[PDB]
Write a protein that binds this DNA or RNA. Structure first.
Ligand SMILES: Nc1ncnc2c1ncn2[C@@H]1O[C@H](CSCC[C@H](N)C(=O)O)[C@@H](O)[C@H]1O
Ligand SMILES: Nc1ncnc2c1ncn2[C@@H]1O[C@H](CSCC[C@H](N)C(=O)O)[C@@H](O)[C@H]1O
Lengths: 183, 284, 284, 188
DNA sequence: GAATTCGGAAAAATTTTTCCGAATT
DNA sequence: GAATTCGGAAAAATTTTTCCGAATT
């Protein structure tokens, strides 16, 4: 839990987003400002050769975001790869214990992870996921962002069988209590 | 201040080589928590070490709270299963599937048990795996542990080939490997009475029986009473550098004992790597 | 006046209990000629005794000249196969057929090795067999060896029932059997670490694995970690009084080692019988 | 089994023989080794040796010949065929002269085809010699082990054995006994 | 009394061999 | 460039379990 910041102290969030780019989705809610072409968002897609010194130089960061490739895109990478790699660089980006400041991370799955993959995710990201539906598509989200209903897995099971920024956006809005509100 | 016993978290412990090597070096062991799933392996560590090892079963059920309560730890060691990474298996599933993905459990728990930045206390760790593995896997493991490995082949201190990679932060891991006086460096040194070794060094021993017969045309290593023979389990124990009968446990036969020994560490190699720890923890 | 090492002919030698008991008593063994046909038994005696035993294979090919050449002998011992004599085998072929008739080979060679009248030199011999045998067979064996047997049950000095007949001329064979200090008299004494004995004495151990499970309803003898279990081979070795790992030879597993041990002698019973020999031969 | 010098005719004595399983009493007189006047007969015949001790053989006085034989082929045997072998060997050693007093002493064992071939090598291992196969021509045969200084292929006897199953032929035995004439009295 | 025992032929399990196989050394 | 290797699914051996069984304590 983080205390909330009075409105005059809030600052523009610095976000590192992996695999996906949420740049102009996150500006749509006012977290970034259009004009910073060297914006406060850093986008990388092939993390496999990135060192801690790389993340530290692009830092500091206040939000770290990663997501599985979209369900359908037949990936060139094992679905857990996006998890373990997200985990690796998130630990490079955390604030030091000596300087605690608001700092949040998000990971979202497109139903591209099977259930043994899911138990790894919830063990490494230290929490069960939240299942956010669309009524047909759905995503799973792990994050420490404080958030604001019921579905069983057989719908998703059969949906996944058969073969999405809308659902990921809303949860981004408790972050307004911490950073500047542009637009 | 003063020397204290070493506290060890050991993942994928196998037949407790970590404990045996520390004991053989004379280091007081205060706590040795071992994560291990094979029931015959657990019997070996249990019986051969008189209940001093605290077993905790599947690595994937050790929690963040477990590391805190069972700790603090001074040494975190592990060698994960190489059956989905080694070149031997055509059905290898890589680093991210099957058992390969068990490495990240070590990466994960290493980070839980590492002291924080305010703590300058000594903390040592080591991770072992095979050389016969894809370059991308060797790269990614060095990405997560954040360092490059040493290659040590047991052939420098034992009678067998065994090239392994060792990642970690122990003192002097890059130093030269020189054999000791008691090292059984040739197969003849390992064999029982009235047996003849055909070769001085044997090919890498795996869990299968094919690794014992040598070369491209599968020749028997030993001659006894005129006839050819394979190696005995006491002889395998000596090649690996374990005490003889170390695996004479739990009614196991030839195949079971070779499986435990086939996947273990070379004791003399591990002794070389752990030896710099004598000056950081209490001795006997 | 002064004693020399003992010279031993041992027929149906098995795993060389005779030699081991002599070595354990401190008797210098000058010659130990063993007749034995099982390749794994010979491997045990060879290995565990560093080539001191002179093996000569099938008892029925030892000639009158062999006994002269290999001799003289001071001690002639044997326990012939009791698989065609014991009550366990309904297909028993008796004393005169099958393997029963191997007894007469011992009778035959005993008389070849006996000194002649006028030779007052010490000559000792012993023959062992089961009690579970027809009275006519027990009578005829005592007809050929010209004397009646003593019956010693190992249960007085070991953790197992084991009643056997001993014919012979050693000193004090009819004396009382009193247990010694180091005798493991209860099953718990034999077991490995972290194992619990349900009973204090186990039923006669045979070459089959059913003999390990106790009684009429076939109960497991041991509890380990809450679950029931059978005996391990080190534990069988201890019940018989062999050194642990005595049969950890030749890649043998559970079944093979139990067969060698199941048909062998109880070492403590044998020591008691041979102990009066210290005063006739050289000591260490 | 020993080699013996022969005895001048005036020194020969009536043989004392121990005969087991089969009695050669009334056959051995036909060659003049026994006489019909003796109270003891100089021949001792016993047929159930299983409870015979050494001192029984010693008390029955000294012996110069020891004979035993398998029962006749046509005899449903109540005894394992090797039993007659081992038992004969058992009492023969009770009867031998001591090494301190060497005198002429002979033994005979003969088989009625009642021993099969694994029993045959037990016989020749224990009696320290191969047997001699003595045939009957118009069909029967016996094999003899003996230390007395006295051609058919085995499938002749093999097939002879198997049909015959459906008494003891002394005719074959007797003649072997002759040479002993050179050692003992020759009663008319 | 009914409990015991130096086993064995079948039968049902575990087990130890043929080929297998390719990237890394 | 020919050899090497902390393995595995089938297949062929080997092995470990069911009933077996009775005279002797
Ligand atoms: N999920 C898991 N949790 C804990 N141990 C596991 C595991 N999966 C496999 N293992 C164990 O990991 C070990 C890999 S082999 C390691 C052997 C060890 N280096 C030694 O010296 O003996 C095997 O013992 C295997 O049984
Ligand atoms: N013909 C023969 N010649 C020599 N030994 C034989 C034989 N037939 C069987 N044997 C052996 O006789 C032994 C009978 S069991 C004897 C066990 C021995 N007294 C001990 O202490 O171990 C077995 O080892 C068997 O292999």
């Amino acid at each position: 839990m983080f205390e909330t910041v009075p409105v005059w102290r809030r600052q523009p969030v610095r976000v590192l987003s992996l695999f996906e780019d949420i740049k102009k989705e996150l500006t749509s809610l006012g977290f970034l400002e259009s004009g910073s072409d060297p914006g406060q968002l850093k986008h990388v897609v092939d993390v496999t050769d990135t060192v801690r010194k790389d993340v530290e130089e692009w830092g500091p960061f206040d939000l770290v975001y990663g997501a599985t490739p979209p369900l359908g895109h037949t990936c060139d990478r094992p679905p857990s790869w996006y998890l373990f790699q997200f985990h690796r660089l998130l630990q490079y980006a955390r604030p030091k214990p000596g300087s605690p400041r608001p700092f949040f991370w998000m990971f979202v799955d497109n139903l591209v992870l099977n259930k043994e993959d899911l138990d790894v995710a919830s063990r490494f990201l230290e929490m069960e996921p939240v299942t956010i539906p669309d009524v047909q598509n759905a995503v799973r989200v792990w994050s420490n962002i404080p958030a604001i209903a019921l579905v069983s897995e057989e719908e998703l099971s059969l949906l996944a069988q058969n073969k999405p920024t809308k659902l990921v956006k809303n949860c981004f809005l408790p972050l307004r209590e911490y950073f500047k509100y542009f637009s | 201040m003063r020397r204290r016993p070493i506290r060890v978290l050991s993942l994928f412990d196998g037949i407790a080589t970590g404990y045996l090597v520390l004991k053989e070096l004379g280091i007081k062991v205060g706590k040795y928590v071992a994560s291990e799933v094979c029931e015959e392996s657990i019997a070996v560590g249990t019986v051969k070490h008189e209940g001093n090892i605290k077993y905790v079963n599947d690595v994937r059920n050790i929690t963040k709270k477990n590391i805190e309560e069972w700790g603090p730890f001074d040494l975190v060691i592990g060698g994960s299963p190489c059956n989905d990474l080694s070149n031997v298996n055509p059905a290898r599933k890589g680093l991210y599937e099957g058992t390969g993905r068990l490495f990240f459990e070590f990466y994960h728990l290493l980070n839980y048990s590492r002291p924080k930045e305010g703590d300058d206390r000594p903390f040592f760790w080591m991770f072992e795996n095979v050389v016969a593995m894809k370059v991308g896997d060797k790269r990614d493991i060095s990405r997560f542990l954040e360092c490059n490995p040493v290659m040590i082949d047991a052939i420098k201190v034992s009678a067998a080939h065994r090239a392994r990679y060792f990642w970690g932060n122990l003192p002097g891991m890059n130093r030269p490997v020189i054999a000791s006086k008691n090292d059984k460096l040739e197969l003849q040194d390992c064999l029982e009475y009235n047996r003849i070794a055909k070769l001085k060094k044997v090919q890498t021993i795996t869990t299968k029986s094919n690794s014992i017969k040598q070369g491209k045309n599968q020749l028997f290593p030993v001659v006894m009473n005129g006839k050819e023979d394979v190696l005995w389990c006491t002889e395998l124990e000596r090649i690996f550098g374990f005490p003889v009968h170390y695996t004479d446990v739990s009614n196991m036969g030839r195949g079971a004992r070779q499986k435990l020994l086939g996947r273990s560490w070379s004791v003399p190699v591990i002794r070389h790597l752990f030896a710099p720890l004598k000056d950081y923890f209490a001795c006997e």
